[PDB]
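Weekly structure sync, notes
Attendees: PL, DS, HV (note-taker this week)

Item 1: Gamma crystallin S
DS walked through the input record. Source organism listed as Mus musculus. Sequence as pasted into the shared doc:
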Amino acid sequence: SKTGGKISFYEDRNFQGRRYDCDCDCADFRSYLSRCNSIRVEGGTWAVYERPNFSGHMYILPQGEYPEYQRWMGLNDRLGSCRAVHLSSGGQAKIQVFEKGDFNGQMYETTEDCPSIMEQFHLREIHSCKVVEGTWIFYELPNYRGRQYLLDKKEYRKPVDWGAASPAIQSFRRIVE
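Item 1 (cont.): predicted structure, written out as tokens:
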């Protein structure tokens, strides 16, 4: 239970340059680092945002070492805020998705990751879904590519409820550690 996540950001590639270490969520770390082109995650998972106030592109980083921003699929080396993602275990993660908003339309339930929603469910978009686990990732393009959205053990009734400006979502995966 009592763990201790920690993430280190470096201004240059190969963990060179000024470094900044964080052990909790930080809404604005720009005062400690003006840019980050590489990151090291010593423990725990973390969500990073391109602009302050958890806004702009969002990416989930599992424990590991990333000697360059491209290793984290970063679009650039701009990061204004970071939050620690908490993982929930317990037993078997199950997700239910609905073809229309407000949990309406045809419903499909699965306990496995989905690389291509259109190939698996023949659906071009997702407007609502109820996942009860704690850490789920949704991706805008197939094969877990494009902008990613982090879902919690809550129910999303509208597409904008998961931070997306469009109901376009093509793949999703469960987070485990």
